[PDB]
């Protein structure tokens, strides 16, 4: 039951749930940035390093899911069933994939210690009187 | 686009796919053994596949609960528990076996199975080759 993909990496599930859902980016943007900046790195058969097998395993679930969507498109003649299932496959469940991709990506470039402190600082910043906090939100930057 | 879990582990999808679909085991017992005898990133891959299966089971249960229309249920359940589990079984078996026998003592087993299948049934030796201890 205690299946936390972030446990081994030092983070935990509650930390990600600290921030609001809407703050996270979309999907196609993550795919595009990954393809643009790490094509060779993910393609390389070398052992590379942690987080790389993780991204490889993560993208696969999204792929298959979309395969299921395009498969059920033609089938499932009933209109209502069609729309409901397809929306569920691509509007509710993808939240987790988002989170995974964003966490991994942020870890790759700007470090780990950095993404953790950014997460905690951002979590504290949001929950605090609006007039008693710095005017600007914390941009990850480098 | 060029994604395939097998490539980075010194294995090629051809070796893992040369086997027939019937040779693979069920998913209930494979899950049980995986949990029982287990707890490199190979462990992280096993955990990810575990999560994938579990979330698929959550999806199937939820779709069963809702969707009052009866017909769609059978199609959705069959597709996620038959077609969508073949590869899951494949990945789990491939990522589990090697933890016990070892890397090499795996490739040789995979290649011998291709030779065995290629041999006509008439000239095929009776035994059932296995990697053993």
């Amino acid at each position, epitope marked *: 039951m205690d299946i936390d993909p972030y446990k081994e990496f030092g983070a935990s599930v509650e930390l990600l749930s600290f921030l609001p859902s809407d703050f996270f980016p979309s999907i196609r943007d993550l795919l595009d940035t990954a393809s643009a900046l790490y094509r060779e790195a993910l393609e390389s058969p070398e052992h590379c390093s942690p987080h790389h097998t993780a991204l490889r395993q993560a993208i696969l679930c999204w792929g298959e899911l979309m395969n299921l969507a395009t498969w059920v498109g033609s*089938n499932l003649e009933d209109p209502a069933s069609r729309e409901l299932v397809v929306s569920y496959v691509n509007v509710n469940m993808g939240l987790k994939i988002r989170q995974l991709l964003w966490f991994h990506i942020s870890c790759l470039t700007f470090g780990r210690e950095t993404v953790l402190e950014y997460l905690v600082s951002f979590g504290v910043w949001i929950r605090t009187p609006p007039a008693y906090r710095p005017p600007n939100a914390p941009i990850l930057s480098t | 686009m060029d994604i395939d879990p097998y490539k980075e582990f010194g294995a090629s999808v051809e070796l893992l796919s040369f086997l027939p679909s019937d040779f693979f085991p069920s998913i209930r017992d494979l899950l049980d053994t995986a949990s029982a005898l287990y707890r490199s990133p190979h462990h992280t891959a096993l955990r990810q596949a575990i999560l994938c299966w579990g979330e698929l089971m959550n999806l199937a249960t939820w779709v069963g609960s809702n969707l*009052e*229309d009866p017909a*769609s249920r059978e199609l959705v359940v069959s597709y996620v528990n038959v077609n969508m589990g073949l590869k899951i079984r494949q990945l789990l078996w491939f990522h589990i076996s090697c933890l016990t026998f070892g890397r090499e003592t795996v490739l040789e087993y995979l290649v011998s199975f291709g030779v065995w299948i290629r041999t006509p049934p008439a000239y095929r030796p009776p035994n059932a080759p296995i990697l053993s201890t």
Partner: antibody
Amino acid sequence: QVQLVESGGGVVQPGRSLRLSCAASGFNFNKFGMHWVRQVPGKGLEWLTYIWYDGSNADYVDSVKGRFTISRDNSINTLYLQMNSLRADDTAVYFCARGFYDSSSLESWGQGALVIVSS
Amino acid sequence: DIVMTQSPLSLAVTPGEPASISCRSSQTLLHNNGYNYFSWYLQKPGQAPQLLIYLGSNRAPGVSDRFSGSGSGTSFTLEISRVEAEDVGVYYCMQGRHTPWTFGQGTKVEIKR
């Protein structure tokens, strides 16, 4: 078991237009489709048209194509079938039904109502 | 678009004996889901139609086991093991592969005089 009751049937003078009432209750109207079935005496059943839950799409048969229309009001869960340019060949009893065995065959059929035209 | 067909037009059965009726369709009904969209309906004078077989080979809920059917593709058959006095009526077969929906010609049963 769902029970459906129609209304509005009766005799209509030739050349005019009439509208029939078919209301339903006891199940989720927004989650299922509706169909119209006709029977002139002497022959069997004949399919006419149907509408999907959203109502954006619709279909018609060539016999009444372009002269009949169907619409639904999900606020009150009531069906509607509008008749214009009625002919002597249209004298029949009309039935509205619902199909849910994977969107193929009708399951519950209403009691129906007869429509008669004459001078 | 689809041409429907039924045969035989009439069949009088001594009750307690089996009987079979055949309905044929022009175009194949095997969709990519392994299912066939074909129907069996029962109609009684002065009453609304009732369901007989659903999805080609599955019995509709509440229907007695005395009626059974099977088949695939462009050929199907309705079989009744034992005829009871309440089984008199006109039977229909329908198509739901492609819109628009089409009905058959009908088959009425009675008692051989």
